[PDB]
Amino acid sequence: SMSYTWTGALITPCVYATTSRSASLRQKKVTFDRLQVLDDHYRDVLKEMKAKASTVKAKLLSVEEACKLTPPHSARSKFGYGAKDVRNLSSKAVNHIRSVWKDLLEDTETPIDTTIMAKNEVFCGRKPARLIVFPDLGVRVCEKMALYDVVSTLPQAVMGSSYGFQYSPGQRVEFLVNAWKAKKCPMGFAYDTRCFDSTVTENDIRVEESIYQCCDLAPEARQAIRSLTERLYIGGPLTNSKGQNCGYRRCRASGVLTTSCGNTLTCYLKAAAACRAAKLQDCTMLVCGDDLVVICESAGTQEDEASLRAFTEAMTRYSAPPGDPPKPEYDLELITSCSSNVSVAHDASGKRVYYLTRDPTTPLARAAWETARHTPVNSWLGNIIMYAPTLWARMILMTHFFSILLAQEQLEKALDCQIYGACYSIEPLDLPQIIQRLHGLSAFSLHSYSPGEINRVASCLRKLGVPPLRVWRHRARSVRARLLSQGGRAATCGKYLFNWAVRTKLKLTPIPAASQLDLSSWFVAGYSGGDIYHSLSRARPRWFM
Numbered sequence: 131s132m133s134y135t136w137t138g139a140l141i142t143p144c145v146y147a148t149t150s151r152s153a154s155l156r157q158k159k160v161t162f163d164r165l166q167v168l169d170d171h172y173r174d175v176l177k178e179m180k181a182k183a184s185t186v187k188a189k190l191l192s193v194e195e196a197c198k199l200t201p202p203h204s205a206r207s208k209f210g211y212g213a214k215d216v217r218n219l220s221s222k223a224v225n226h227i228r229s230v231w232k233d234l235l236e237d238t239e240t241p242i243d244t245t246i247m248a249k250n251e252v253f254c255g256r257k258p259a260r261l262i263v264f265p266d267l268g269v270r271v272c273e274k275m276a277l278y279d280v281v282s283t284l285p286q287a288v289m290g291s292s293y294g295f296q297y298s299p300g301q302r303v304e305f306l307v308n309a310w311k312a313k314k315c316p317m318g319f320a321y322d323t324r325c326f327d328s329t330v331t332e333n334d335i336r337v338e339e340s341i342y343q344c345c346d347l348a349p350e351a352r353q354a355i356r357s358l359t360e361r362l363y364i365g366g367p368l369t370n371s372k373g374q375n376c377g378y379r380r381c382r383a384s385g386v387l388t389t390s391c392g393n394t395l396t397c398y399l400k401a402a403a404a405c406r407a408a409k410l411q412d413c414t415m416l417v418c419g420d421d422l423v424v425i426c427e428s429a430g431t432q433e434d435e436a437s438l439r440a441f442t443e444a445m446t447r448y449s450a451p452p453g454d455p456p457k458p459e460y461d462l463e464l465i466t467s468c469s470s471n472v473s474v475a476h477d478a479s480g481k482r483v484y485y486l487t488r489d490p491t492t493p494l495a496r497a498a499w500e501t502a503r504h505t506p507v508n509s510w511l512g513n514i515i516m517y518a519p520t521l522w523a524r525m526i527l528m529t530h531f532f533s534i535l536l537a538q539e540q541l542e543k544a545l546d547c548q549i550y551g552a553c554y555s556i557e558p559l560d561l562p563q564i565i566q567r568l569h570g571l572s573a574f575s576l577h578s579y580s581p582g583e584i585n586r587v588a589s590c591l592r593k594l595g596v597p598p599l600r601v602w603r604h605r606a607r608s609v610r611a612r613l614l615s616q617g618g619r620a621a622t623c624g625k626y627l628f629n630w631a632v633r634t635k636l637k638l639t640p641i642p643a644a645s646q647l648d649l650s651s652w653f654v655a656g657y658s659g660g661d662i663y664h665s666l667s668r669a670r671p672r673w674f675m
């Protein structure tokens with residue numbers, strides 16, 4: 131069947147930013163009939179995944195628990211209530227949610243409506259806008275009730291160490307390094323599927339439900355998963371922001387709670403089966419939605435290229451064809467996945483420290499957009515958290531935004547930021563404790579960065595018209611002195627985040643309050659399009675902190 135069908139009605143709106151104008155270019159790319167052929171390897175991997183899903187027990191979330199997971203800027207319902215009313219348990223929101231739940235239990239077939247919109251992302255010719263497909267707020271709260279506990283428990287039980295969303299950046303690096311080191315002669319590659327969401331078939335969506343159905347589930351959760359699969363996840367009608375019928379979808383909706391979990395399971399299933407078809411030796415896989423990395427035993431240059439072509443042919447039969455063909459790599463640092471690569475630096479005692487970095491062009495361009503225009507959900511803060519050990523995040527992002535926060539007297543104001551998938555409510559004053567937990571204490575002492583990494587950063591600044599690194603050091607000394615003078619958490623930001631800026635660096639001790647941070651909800655599962663709100667909370671705060 132066709133991934134999408136269009137009525138011709140426009141996808142209406144609600145250093146460039148992608149707009150509704152280019153939506154038509156994306157529609158042509160994502161629209162095609164799918165060809166899928168399954169085999170024994172696919173069937174065997176599926177049964178193995180189901181045997182692991184069989185060990186899971188999931189709970190049904192209450193209306194209140196689901197309501198409290200709704201982000202404050204979450205799209206309002208077409209039934210006269212918004213995210214605020216949901217979060218406050220307003221009688222109107224709750225009554226509509228309970229009626230939507232009841233309708234999921236009683237109607238097993240009627241397709242559920244979705245809104246189709248062009249996403250506005252900043253980029254540095256110009257690429258078309260990505261499309262977002264999501265059901266009404268009431269349905270989204272119901273999705274959390276039935277499946278929040280499934281999507282946060284099941285993927286790790288099924289995929290184990292291959293499940294990408296269970297790791298802090300520090301744990302992710304450690305996993306990749308250990309897997310690389312475990313091979314006699316390692317080879318690794320990134321596999322990129324062309325329009326993954328469009329390649330997801332109705333059968334893939336039912337196979338995914340067959341995995342969810344192996345959980346111990348409450349009867350209402352079992353029925354809601356069944357109804358949601360048939361009425362929403364396999365496909366349904368598309369409506370634009372003006373309420374006009376846009377067409378029909380028979381592929382993955384990018385804005386449902388199961389998008390991230392579903393894509394990870396599907397990509398893992400197809401890839402693990404394609405590893406067997408290609409006869410790749412001693413595979414270690416890492417899967418993040420549609421992003422896949424395979425680390426294995428090299429069998430020689432020609433052998434490796436041949437096995438990759440066989441892998442690609444098996445992925446293609448499973449309806450996962452590639453965008454760019456995979457390339458074998460013989461250095462862990464040469465693999466690019468999730469726009470990132472591993473690099474190494476030294477801590478304060480000369481010991482090696484591995485870390486994740488990326489080309490800083492897009493993060494810096496988006497931070498420039500966000501300093502120009504007010505944006506309810508930022509990427510700069512997400513880039514600071516994710517890339518805290520990098521030279522560019524420390525010297526430029528931290529310096530620039532802490533000087534703004536000092537000037538606006540907004541150091542204590544919690545901000546919403548997006549990191550890959552999910553939405554996080556963070557107080558900039560908590561950045562030292564967050565960084566220490568995610569990256570370790572060495573993130574505040576890294577030096578001896580690689581020439582390639584220093585040169586990529588310096589060239590990026592020249593190309594973007596950003597002042598050179600020596601200006602950033604002078605600005606950080608001033609920012610640091612002012613933060614120190616404020617005491618408490620502000621002085622900790624000055625001392626830890628800007629220790630790189632002083633000639634004689636201070637000896638840094640662990641932050642005591644870093645121990646009390648509850649970060650379980652952060653790196654448990656992926657919620658890209660899932661509509662999940664994460665607000666930082668601390669258990670047992672000491673009086674002297």
Ligand SMILES: O=C(O)/C=C/c1ccc(NC(=O)C2(NC(=O)c3ccc4c(C5CCCCC5)c5n(c4c3)CC(=O)Nc3ccccc3-5)CCCC2)cc1
Nearest residue numbers: 145494495496497498501526527530594595596597598601
């Ligand atoms: O060689 C030497 O000894 C000294 C050289 C030197 C060169 C330029 C300056 N620049 C400045 O003072 C000003 N801009 C900046 O001090 C500035 C700061 C951040 C900038 C950023 C981003 C960096 C990441 C956080 C968000 C802001 C961009 N651009 C920046 C310019 C250049 C710019 O204008 N826009 C963009 C556009 C895309 C990407 C980045 C940028 C402020 C007043 C006059 C212009 C200062 C010193």
Ligand SMILES: CNC(=O)c1c(-c2ccc(F)cc2)oc2ccc(-c3cccc(C(=O)NC(C)(C)C)c3)cc12
Nearest residue numbers: 294299416418421422423465467468470471516549550
């Ligand atoms: C198969 N791809 C990989 O798992 C990723 C690789 C890679 C893998 C292999 C390789 F060789 C090079 C890069 O680099 C990455 C960089 C970031 C992410 C990534 C994805 C989702 C979440 C988070 C997160 O930290 N969120 C918090 C904790 C909120 C900061 C982070 C995933 C990958």
